[PDB]
Design a protein around this ligand. Structure first.
Ligand SMILES: Nc1ncnc2c1ncn2[C@H]1C[C@H](O)[C@@H](COP(=O)(O)OP(=O)(O)OP(=O)(O)O)O1
Ligand SMILES: [Ca+2]
Length: 270
DNA sequence: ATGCCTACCACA
DNA sequence: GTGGTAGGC
């Protein structure tokens, strides 16, 4: 309720101011886009598009995964797109990983990713009995000369988290040995620009309706798009009916939890 | 016409 | 300890 009231209170504050089957609908307000989704029989999802302005202004788009990919895959249009991870929606385990390269000259980013996956896979086994390995982790890279940047999206067989807030509670729980510095989790500690210690794992992405940059999109002011990392070990099952790139796209979507008649939903309370 | 929220510091 | 905020995702 405390979270539902504050959101609805922004709606009252904002209130102060034949053909082929297709569902391409744009909205200025995120709440309007979700109101349309609930009022829509098809399986549509909310995307966020960065506006040309240098700020973080966003315009929200509702459509199906398939139609979005159709108009998105050429990378000629819809640059700088984000997935809106809906609050209270089941979601995959995912990570935002970063550190300043000049400020961490000794750090081996590739090694840190493998160690993190190893530890997270142990925690999933000890706390939930879930078995997985690096072969289940989609590894996306957006690194620059200055920044080591990865997105990991776990592809767990018939398993998902209740919502992305629970993902955050799970990570805060198992990374507590590392947060205390700010099990031996010293490898996660990195320096920011100002020499202030931080964790390699960005915990700020587990918030309600978090935007999460799409596979093959870049930030508005930049040119580096998220692409599959060379050391990626998750390979989707190939199908004669869909392209491999579409399969990677669907795997990369945090909110695109594979339908299963034996799905287990993992919760983690604060 | 973006949304979210913790870390941080000043006050009983 | 809470406010109470603005700085960062
Ligand atoms: N100003 C914002 N408004 C809304 N959502 C945001 C904003 N900044 C970041 N986000 C969301 C989208 C990002 O994909 C996600 C993580 O932030 P961040 O690490 O800065 O970007 P990123 O991981 O997409 O690129 P990179 O780290 O390579 O610069 O949080
Ligand atoms: Ca990042």
């Amino acid at each position: 309720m405390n979270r539902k009231w504050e959101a609805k209170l922004k709606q009252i504050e904002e209130r102060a101011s034949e053909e082929p089957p297709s569902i391409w609908r744009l909205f200025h307000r995120q709440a309007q886009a979700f109101n349309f989704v609930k009022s829509c029989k098809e399986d549509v999802h909310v995307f966020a598009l960065e506006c040309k302005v240098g700020d973080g202004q966003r315009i929200y788009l509702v459509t199906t995964y398939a139609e979005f990919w159709f108009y998105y895959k050429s990378r000629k249009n819809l640059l700088h797109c984000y997935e809106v991870i809906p609050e209270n929606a089941v979601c995959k385990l995912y990570f935002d990983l970063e550190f300043n390269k000049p400020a961490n000259p000794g750090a081996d980013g590739k090694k840190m990713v493998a160690l993190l996956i190893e530890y997270v896979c142990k925690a999933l086994q000890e706390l939930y009995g879930v078995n997985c390995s690096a072969e289940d982790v989609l590894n996306l890279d957006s690194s620059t000369d200055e920044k080591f940047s990865r997105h990991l999206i776990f592809q767990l067989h018939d398993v998902a988290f209740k919502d992305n807030i629970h993902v955050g509670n799970f990570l805060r729980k198992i990374l507590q040995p590392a947060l205390d510095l700010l099990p031996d989790l010293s490898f996660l500690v990195v320096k920011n620009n100002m020499g202030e210690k931080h964790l390699f794992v960005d915990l700020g992405v587990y918030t309600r309706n978090r935007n999460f940059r799409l596979y093959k999109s870049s930030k508005i002011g930049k040119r580096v798009a998220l692409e599959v990392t060379e050391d990626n070990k998750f390979f989707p099952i190939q199908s004669k009916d869909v392209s491999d790139e579409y399969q990677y796209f669907l795997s990369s979507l945090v909110s695109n939890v594979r339908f299963s008649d034996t799905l287990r939903i993992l919760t983690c309370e604060p």
